Amino acid sequence: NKLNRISRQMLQEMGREPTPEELAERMLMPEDKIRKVLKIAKEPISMETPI
Amino acid sequence: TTDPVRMYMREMGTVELLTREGEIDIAKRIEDGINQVQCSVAEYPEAITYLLEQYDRVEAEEARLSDLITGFVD
Amino acid sequence: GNRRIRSVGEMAENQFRVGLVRVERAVKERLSLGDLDTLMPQDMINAKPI
Amino acid sequence: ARVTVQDAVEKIGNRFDLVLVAARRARQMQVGGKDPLVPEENDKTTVIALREIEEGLINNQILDVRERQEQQEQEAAELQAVTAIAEGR
Amino acid sequence: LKAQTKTEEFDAIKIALASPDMIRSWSFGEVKKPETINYRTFKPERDGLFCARIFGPVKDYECLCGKYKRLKHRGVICEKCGVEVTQTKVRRERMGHIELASPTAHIWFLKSLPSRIGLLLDMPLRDIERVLYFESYVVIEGGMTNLERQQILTEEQYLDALEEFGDEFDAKMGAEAIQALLKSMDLEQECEQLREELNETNSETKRKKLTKRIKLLEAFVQSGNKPEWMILTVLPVLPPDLRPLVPLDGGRFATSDLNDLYRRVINRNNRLKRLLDLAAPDIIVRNEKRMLQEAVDALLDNGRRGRAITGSNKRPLKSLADMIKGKQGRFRQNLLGKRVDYSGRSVITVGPYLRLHQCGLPKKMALELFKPFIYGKLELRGLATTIKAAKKMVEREEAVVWDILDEVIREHPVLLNRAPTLHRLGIQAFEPVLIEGKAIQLHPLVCAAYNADFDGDQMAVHVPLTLEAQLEARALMMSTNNILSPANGEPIIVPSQDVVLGLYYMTRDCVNAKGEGMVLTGPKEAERLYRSGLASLHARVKVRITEYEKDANGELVAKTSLKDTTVGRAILWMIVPKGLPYSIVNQALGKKAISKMLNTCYRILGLKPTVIFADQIMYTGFAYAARSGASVGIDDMVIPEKKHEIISEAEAEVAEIQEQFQSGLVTAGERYNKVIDIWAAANDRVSKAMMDNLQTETVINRDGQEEKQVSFNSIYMMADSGARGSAAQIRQLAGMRGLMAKPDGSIIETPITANFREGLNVLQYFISTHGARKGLADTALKTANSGYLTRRLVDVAQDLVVTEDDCGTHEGIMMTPVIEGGDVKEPLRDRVLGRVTAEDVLKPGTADILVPRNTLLHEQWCDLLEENSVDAVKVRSVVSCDTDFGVCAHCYGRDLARGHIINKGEAIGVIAAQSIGEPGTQLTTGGLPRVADLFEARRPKEPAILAEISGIVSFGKETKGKRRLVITPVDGSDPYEEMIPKWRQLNVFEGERVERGDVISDGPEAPHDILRLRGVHAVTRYIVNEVQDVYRLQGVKINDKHIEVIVRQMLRKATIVNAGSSDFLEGEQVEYSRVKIANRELEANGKVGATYSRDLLGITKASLATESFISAASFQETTRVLTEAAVAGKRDELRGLKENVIVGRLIPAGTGYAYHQDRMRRRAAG
Amino acid sequence: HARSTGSYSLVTQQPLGGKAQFGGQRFGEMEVWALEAYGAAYTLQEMLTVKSDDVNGRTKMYKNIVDGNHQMEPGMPESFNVLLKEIRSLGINIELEDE
Ligand SMILES: [Mg+2]
Ligand SMILES: [Zn+2]
Ligand SMILES: [Zn+2]
Secondary structure, three states: OHHHHHHHHHHHHOOOOOOOOHHHHHOOOOOOHHHHHHHHOOOOEEOOOOO | OOOOHHHHHHHHOOOOOOOHHHHHHHHHHHHHHHHHHHHHHHOOHHHHHHHHHHHHHHHOOOOOHHHOOOOOOO | OOOOOOOHHHHHHHHHHHHHHHHHHHHHHHHHHOOOOOOOOOOOOOOOOO | OOOOOHHHHHHOOOOHHHHHHHHHHHHHHHOOOOOOOOOOOOOOHHHHHHHHHHOOOOOHHHHHHHHHHHHHHHHHHOHHHHHHHHHHO | OOOOOOOOOOOOEEEEEOOHHHHHHHEEEEOOOOOOEOOOOOOEOOOOOOOOOOOOOOOOOOOOOOOOOOOOOOOOEOOOOOOEOOOHHHHHOOEEEEEEEEEEEOHHHHHOOOOHHHHHOOOOHHHHHHHHOOOOEEEOOOOOOOOOOOOEEOHHHHHHHHHHOOOOOOEEOOHHHHHHHHHHOOHHHHHHHHHHHHHHOOOHHHHHHHHHHHHHHHHHHHHOOOHHHHEEEEEEEOOHHHOOOOEOHHHOEEEOHHHHHHHHHHHHHHHHHHHHHOOOOHHHHHHHHHHHHHHHHHHHOOOOOOOOEOOOOOOEOOOHHHHHOOOOOOOOOOOOOOEOOOEEEEEEEOOOOOOOOEEEEEHHHHHHHOHHHHHHHHHHOOOOOOHHHHHHHHHHOOOOHHHHHHHHHOOOOEEEEOOOOOOHHHEEEEEEEEEOOOOEEOOHHHHHHHOOOOOOOEEEEEOOOOHHHHHHHHHHHEOOOOOEOOOOOOEOOOOOOHHHHHHHHHOOOOOOOOOOOOEEOOHHHHHHHHHOOOOOOOOEEEEEEEEEEOEOOOEOEEEEEEEEEEHHHHHHOOOOOOOOOHHHOOOOOOHHHHHHHHHHHHHHHOHHHHHHHHHHHHHHHHHHHHHHOOOOOHHHOOOOOOHHHHHHHHHHHHHHHHHHHHOOOOOHHHHHHHHHHHHHHHHHHHHHHHHHHHHHOOEOOOOOOOOEOOOOOHHHHHHHHOOOOOHHHHHHHOOOOOOOEOOOOOEOOOOOOOOOOOOOOHHHHHHHHHHHHHHHHHHHHHHHHHHHHHHHHHHHOOOOOEOOOOOOOOOOEEEOOOOOOOOOOOOHHHHHOOOEEOOOEEOOOOOOEEEOOOOEOOHHHHHHHHHOOOOOEEEOOOOOOOOOOOEOHHHHOOOOOOOOOOOOOOOHHHHHHHHHHHHHHHOOOOOHHHHHHHHOOOOOOOOOOEOOOOEEEEEOOOOOOOOOEEEEOOOOOOOOEEOOOOOOOOOOOOOOEEOOOOEOOOOOOOHHHHHHHHOHHHHHHHHHHHHHHHHHHHOOOOOHHHHHHHHHHHOOEEEEOOOOOOOOOOEEEHHHHHHHHHHHOOOOOOOOOOOEEEOOOOHHHHOOOOOOHHHHHHHOOHHHHHHHHHHHOOEEOOOOHHHHHHHOOOOOOHHHHHHHHHHHHHOOOO | OEEOOOEEOOOOOOEEOOOOOOOOOEOOHHHHHHHHHOOOHHHHHHHHOOOOOOOOHHHHHHHHHHHOOOOOOOOOOHHHHHHHHHHHHOOEEEEOOOO
C-alpha cells in the first residue's frame, strides 16, 4: 500500500512515473526488495482467460 | 427477489434504531445479567477450591500467573 | 446518406472524451472539500485515468 | 505391394473379419512366433498375411485349429512339471 | 468362482445421487482452509485446496518435508507431515470434501427447468425458494391440528399457530426444513393415493401433470435414491491438478477460476461455523447461511442466480457446470475434439506420375513422422548401438538412414485428409512415396472425391500405428478399395478434365487427314504409323482388331473383325482389357461416355482389372492431351455475325411496347413483363446462333468441294468433351451475357448486351456485381448450412448398423419408374438396381419366374427385366425390415464402393447421412431448405385435409368459424365429424363418396396425415419421391436407400393404444414394443398384446430419444441430460457409437463389431 | 508441419507445440464419422486414445514401436477420466459397473 501512495503522487509529480528504484529510496527497507515484493504481490491470472 | 444483499437489507431494516437513552437501558441489562452469573459462580464451593488448587500450582512453578487470572479489581 | 464515415481522428476524440468524464467526477469530488490556496490544478487532475 | 485386397475378400466373405483374421496372423509373424507360409517379397507381415489369405491356406478356422493344436503341444512339455505340483495335496 | 474386486474391464456405467457418506468415501481429507501456497516457498499449505497431506506429493515419489526422498520408500506415510510418497499423478485423482454447517440446496435440482425438488414434493418453486431464503416458514408433518403438510406460514401466523398448539405440530424454515420434508416423505404411500386420484377425475389438464409426476416417483423409488440427497451435507472438492496453480513465465501465476470459487465457499462456511460458537443473532446467521447458499450455487453452475464475477476481472468466473457444458454439449469429442500425434500437413501439388494407390510424401515430413519406427529399425539391424545413438543419427541426418526409411515406408499406408470432410472418401489411405521437396503430391483421379482443387488447399497426414490400423487402412480406407461413391454406384474415380480432353482429342475424326482410308493389321502398327509421323491421330481407317466377350459360361470368347474406326481409337484400344467389346471405344469418348466405360469395366472384369485400367487411362489422357497442343486464344471465341442485328430487332420490340404504354394500350406491369420477355427471347436467339456457328463452322475438303463437321476450335472441344465449360458459360464469353438482377430480386429490363470478348462499360459491370456478390454470399453461407444438415442427420441415424443377415419378411415397397408428366424423368432400372426383390416376379405369362424371390438384382438381372416388358418390381427396403435394433443385410442392398452385397456389420447410418450431405453444397418452394423441412416433418402453412374415414360425407351445422363435415360409412358407425373452417375454398364433392385419404381440399398435406391415413409405405414413398425431386432438379444422383434409412429413423417411435402390459398413451420404441407384443403373442398371457399407432418424428426430434445418456450429454444441453438421468439412476450400457467414442473403446461396428458381439453374449450369461 | 512426439498440454494431456515444433493435426468430429463409415475401428480407437489422450497408452505404445511389436494397450483417455471427476465433483455419484 505504501508504494501505491507514492506511485500516485509521483505519477504526475515526475510527469512520467517513478523509476523502479525511485520509490526504493523513499521507502525505508533495503530498497532492492521492490522487485521481489512487487512480484509475489501480483494476483494470479485466470486460467480461463480467453485469448 | 433473491439476490441475498436484498433479503438482508430488508430483514434488518425492520429493527428500529436505538435512542441514545435506549442504549444505556440495554447496557444496564447486561450488567445485571453478568453480575448474576458472577455472583452465581461465587456461590459454588468447588469453584473456590479449584481456584485455590490452581494458584498452589502457580506457586509450585507448575503454571504461570498469566494463565489463571487477568487481575482483580485493580 | 444515412451511412456516416468515421476515422482515426473522430474515434480518438471519443476516447479522450471518455477519459475526461471519468476525471470530471474526481475533480468535483476534490473541489468539494478543498482548502483554499494549498491545492492547485495538479493535485486534482491525474494522468493514468485519462 | 498389394494394390487391391479384393481376392482376399472373396476368400472370407465379411471383409471385416478379414481385417481381424489377417491381423491375428500378421502378429503371429511380426512377433517372431512363426514364419511366412508363402514367399516373402520384402512385403511386411501386413501384406504377407494377405497373400496367405489369397492362397487359401490361412483363415479363422485354420488358425483356431492350429492354436488349439499348439495348446496340446505345450501341455505335453509341461506334463511332468505341472503334475509334479502334486504338493497341492 | 469369485467375480472380482480390483481392475477388470468394465461394461456399462451407472449414475445416481451421492450420499453424504458416499461423498466421504472419495474424500481423502477435509479442506479446512482457503490457503493455497505458502507465498514464499511455493509448497502447498497443509489442509488447503492444495495439500500434500490430503491430495498428493508435489513431485514424484518424494515426501513434502523431504525426509524420505528415496525411490525405494513408497507406502510410507511420513511421521512429520503425513504424505504417502507416490507419483504426482495421484494429485489428479484423489478428491476431498467439506462438511457444511447448514444444509444447502443443489442448484441443479432446484433450478432445472422441471424443478426436481418442487414436483417431488408437489410444491411450487417460488414457495420453495421463499423458504430457502428464510422469507417464510413452512410446515412439516403437520399432524392433526389446523394445518396442511406443505402449507406455508408467515412470521405472525407461525407465532399464533404455536401458541394454540405447542406440540403435535412442527414447522421449520430454510434448507433444514426442505431436508426435513424430503426425509419425512413416504414415497410408497403417496404413490398409492395418486393412483386412485388419477382414476377418479377425468380431465386432460389434471392427468397430464399427474402422469408426469407419478412416473418420476416410482422411477425415483426404483432408482435407489433417497430424496434427502438433493440437499447437500458434504461437498466434494475437485482434485487440485484439474485446477492447477502452475507458474508461468516472468514468475506470474495462473489458476483456474474454481479456486476463486472454491475459496469463497470455504470462507463463508468457516465463518458460519464460527458464528455458531459465537451465538450470533438470527438476522446475521441467516444472512451468512444465504451467503453460503449463494457461494455453493455459484460454484456448481454460475449464471443461474447473480452471476458472480471473478476477482479483479470483469469476466464471470467459469463454474463446474460450465466445464462440462459448452458448444455444443461436451468439448471432448465434439468439434474439436483433441489433437493427435503422428501427423502433419502441407500444401498439395499434382504428381501425375503416381499410380492410384500411392502418393508423394515430402522427405522431411516422413522422417519426423516415422521417428519411432526408424529408431527401432535402426538398432534391429545393428546400424545404431542404442536408441539414443539412433536419435543422433537421424538428428545428424546421416546418409544411411534414408534407406532404412524406405523399409519402414514400403508397405506402410498413410492417411490423407482434406478440410471439409463430408463423405467417407474425405479420408483415404495411400502407400507413401518419398519425394524431395515440401509439397504433398496427390493422384489426380482422387482429386474428385476430396473436392480438392490445387489453388493452394492443404492436406493432413496421419500414420496408422497399430497393425490392425495398417490392415484397416489397406483393406478399408485404401484408395483402390473405394472407387465408387457410396451415394450412388457410379465411379467417383472418373477422369476429371485434362485426361478427358486428351481422350476426346484422341478418338475424334476430321474429314480428311493423313492416312485416311488405309488398313492396318493391328493397334501395334497403328501407333507405329502415328508416332512416326505418317498418319494423323484422327483419320477414318479400317483395322483388324481382336475383341473379347465373356458371354460364355465364366469364359472369355474371342472374335476378330475389320472395324471401321480412326487411328486414335485404334491406338487407345491397347489399354482396354480383355472382355470389353470394341464398341465402347469406337465413339467420340466424351466425359459422359468415358465414365460409363470404367463402370462397365468394373461390373464385368471386377475390381483389379479396373484399377490398372483407370491408371492407364489417366496416363494416356494427360500424355496425348499434351501432344495435342490444345490452347485458348482470344480469336478462339467466335461472335455471331448477326449479333448486332439481333440486338437491334429486340431493341425495336422494347420501343414498340413502350409506345403502347405511353398511349395507355398496356398497363405498367404488363409492359415490364413484356419487355423482359423480348430481351430474354433475344438472349436465347443469340445463344442458339453462336452455338450453331461455333459448333459446326469447320468446313473442310475431302477430294471434293466441301463438307462440314463439328468444329475443332479449342473452346468448343473443352465444352463438348465434358472437360470444362458449359453452354451457359460459353454463352457469356461470346454471345451476350444474361439480364442481371437488382438487389431486391427484380430483374433489370436493360440486360447486358456485351460479353467478355468485347468490353463491358461502367454500368454493365456495376450491374454485374450484384449477381457476383449474391453468388459468393449464397455459396459461402449455404456451405455452412449444408454441414448443419449432415449434423442433424448423423445424430438421428448413427447407431443404425447392419446386424442380422436376413430378417425374413416378404414385406417391401413397390418400385416403379418416376414417370413425371412427360416420359420417364428416371427409369425403372435405376430405381431397382442393387436392391433385392421382395417376391418372385412374373413374365407377362406365368408359372415362369424371371427373378426368383429374394435375389440381388445386378446388371444382368436388371437387363433381363428390361428384356421382358416388366414395368414394376416390389423391393425390400430398410424401412420395412423386421429386424429389431438394426437392419438386416438382405433388406439393404449391395451398394458400397464394392459391388458385393453389403457386408454384415457395416454402419449404414453414417454413410446414409454422409451420402445425403456431401452433395448438399450444390443446392440453392425448393432448394436445400425444402429438404430440411421434409426431414423435419414440419406441417406446411396452408395444408390440405384428407378424408378421415371412407364413406359418403356431407356438410352439417352452420358457420361458427367451422362448418362441420359429417361422414357416413356404409356398414360402420358414422360418428366422425371434423371441424373445418369454411372460409378455405373446398374441393371434396358434397354429394360424392370419398375414400379415406382423398382430397377434401387442395394444397400440400402434412406427412403426419399420410402416415396416419394412407399408411407407412405411402408416407415413405412420399418423402423419398419429394426429396429426390429436389435433388434431381439440380442433377444430384443419390440412391433412394440412404433416404429410406433416414426415414426409418423418423418413425422409430409409436404411441400405444390398447393395454394389458404397458401404459396407454406412452410414446415408445417400435423395436421395444413390437418385440414385446411378439413375445406376448405366445406364452405369457395368451394374447394380451397391445395395439400401437406408428408415429412420424422429425429428424431433430427423433434424435432426442437415445437410451444412452452419455451420447445425449454430447450433442444435447448437458445440464438437463445429466440431472434427468441422475434421479432415475439410469445405467448406460454403451452399445452405441457416440457413447463408445466418448469412453474411447472399439466402435460397436465394423472391425469392432466382432468385439462387442463377443462381449454382449458374455454379458447376461453364465 | 509434421510431428511425431511433441510436448503435451498440462490441464488435459494433449499434443501441444511448445518448441515451435507444431502440435499434431486436429482430428475432428467429421473425420470420426469418416472413420465410422469405413469399418475401421482400430484406427479410430488409436486416433482418440493412444495417439492423443491416454497419458499411459502413449508411452506403452512408443516402446512397442521401437521393439517391433505393433499393438496398443489402450486404457482410458484422460479427457473422459476428467469428466468423471468433474461430474463427481458435483453431487453426482458416477461409477463403472460389472466386468
Ligand atoms: Mg482454395
Ligand atoms: Zn515428510
Ligand atoms: Zn430386413
